[PDB]
Ligand binder design. Sequence first.
Ligand SMILES: Nc1ncnc2c1ncn2[C@@H]1O[C@H](COP(=O)(O)OP(=O)(O)O)[C@@H](O)[C@H]1O
Lengths: 81, 642
Amino acid sequence: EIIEAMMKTIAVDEEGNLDVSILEVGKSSKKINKIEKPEEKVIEAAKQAGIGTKADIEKLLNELKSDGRVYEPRAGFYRVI
Amino acid sequence: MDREEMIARFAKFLINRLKDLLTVTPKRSLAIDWAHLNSFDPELADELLNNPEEAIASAEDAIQIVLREPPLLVEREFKVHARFYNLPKTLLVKELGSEHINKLIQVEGIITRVSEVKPFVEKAVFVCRDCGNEMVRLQRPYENLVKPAKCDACGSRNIELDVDKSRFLNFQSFRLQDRPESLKGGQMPRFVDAILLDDLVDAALPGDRVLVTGVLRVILEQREKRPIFKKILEVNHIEQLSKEIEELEISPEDEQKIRELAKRKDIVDAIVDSIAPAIWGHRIVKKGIALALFGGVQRTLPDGTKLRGESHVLLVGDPGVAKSQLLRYVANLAPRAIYTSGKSSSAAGLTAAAVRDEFTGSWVLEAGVLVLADGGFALIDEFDKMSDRDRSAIHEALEQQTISISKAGITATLNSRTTVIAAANPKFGRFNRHKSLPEQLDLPPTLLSRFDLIFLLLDEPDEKVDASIAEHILKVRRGEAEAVTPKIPYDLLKKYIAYARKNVHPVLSREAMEEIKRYYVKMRKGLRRGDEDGVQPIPITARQLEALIRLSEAHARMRLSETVTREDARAAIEIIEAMMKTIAVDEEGNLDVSILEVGKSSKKINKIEKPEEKVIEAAKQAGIGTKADIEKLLNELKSDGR
Ligand SMILES: Nc1ncnc2c1ncn2[C@@H]1O[C@H](COP(=O)(O)OP(=O)(O)O)[C@@H](O)[C@H]1O
């Protein structure tokens, strides 16, 4: 009951994934970052695949710049590395 | 004390030992035995351990007289260093303390660090124009800079060094640590820095078992206190340790029960169940580790090459499958095992590297876990998180079993004859069954071509396999007897592995040769016809054929059989076929992963795909891939600039 009440008050995931180990959920996080990682796939894959909203993909491509998943030498054009 | 009398006593004991030296003139040293001197003159041999400063000097001048007096006397009286290789007691690096200072000791261990061939001046003649030219202030190579404050002859202070008349000698400083084979029980890698002189320099490499016997000297490196700050063993003689002392020994009463255990039925099943009894399942992984412990025969061909005799294992899987625990139980079960992590906690944590010492700033070659465990095992946990320097040298240490470093003024090659039973974690958190192994593994694709066994300890939810592991963990926590205890005790099994890796050397038989041949040709043409008009898949490579023979000989050595029985070669096929499913089979067809990938499809699509608003549409109606697949294809192409 303590373990059950802990998982409920945390809301760790929809399917109860162990986000405490990877800091990512399979459905809402791992599936999106797997499909995400001129600008061919930056504009096309964001539309025909329906990966997410404009604000949702913006934070993912931003975090991809730090982890090394999206590289863009120039500001006008952005690419995925 | 009675130095002149000791010279006469040394000359009395000195003559068959000096007789062969009288023949060989270029020999610049003389190997003298302490037990021989103890038989001739026990009181003289006792002074060797008590006052080694006056004993070595008096013995050198004494044997010089025993050299010039008889015939065949050399013209130039070359320096004859008294090398006492044998001693009545053998000390340990951990047992060594401040009590044995200025005493002739014989400490055993393994060399980890070593310096270059640094020349040092023996007779430091200082050039003083005013006066006092040939004056010598005898300095030792480890000692600090010696400089007189004033000339006693004329009172001048114009002091300088005369390196034209100075007689320089060779000098090398190494680090002797505890042997990880047996002295690792103390769990303290204590070190005693030692020095080397002429005929001792370049006499041993790092990661080698040596038995040094010298005088324990001291050095006042710091001026913060009058007492010494660091002790340095002045090595008088160096010698590599014998085989019996550097290998596991078995009692004669145990040699009978080890042979009795070999005659016991289902010996293979007993050893598999005896390896990590706490963890549930993974019997294929347990048998694969068992084949790695009883490594194959290592033979050398007369053509110069040496056939490999090790089987490296890699345990890839999601977190929570007790893949790190499997590297623990084997760490204590294996005879010579160094349990370590992939994290580069030191400059030479994984592979031997070069680092400048803190004493004189000179680069010293420090060994690693793949060097100290030579002729043994090295269980590397978290193999996917390694430094770039270690990742570049493991490609050679796993196949050629050599580590050739030629940087930082240190050029040499080591012997990395270790069985790397490693375990890596996927860089995506959990391993996906829809992607190949190097796609989710941080290890390079060429590095995977070295491991003979790669098991996938994946986590799969199933009511049958989860209810068994749940009740098994409960039995382990409850303290159940048969749930934690092995069928073969760890103490006896540790000797059983050393007995097989030393005495039993199986040889291939005609029955097993036909089984290895029929299996290799059976895999051929398994999937090559599939990917026609392009890169045809190679289901099995000749590299894996050598790995199959190593596993077939591993199963014969585990049974303590001097021949590879047809049943032994069949057992290695099941383990290979089981790994096939993990990689290169039962996944993207055969040839999967291989060197880099199956290519059957990926490579095939690569050649077809090979201001870009037109090329995205061109790939659409081409039908080579869906809009989602052709999207992810160019992300990997943009990664390499394509
Ligand atoms: N077959 C098994 N039997 C018993 N315990 C297991 C088994 N598989 C996984 N475990 C459990 O997994 C937990 C973590 O093990 P660990 O060695 O840390 O795996 P990893 O390092 O991959 O996370 C342990 O508490 C252990 O009890």
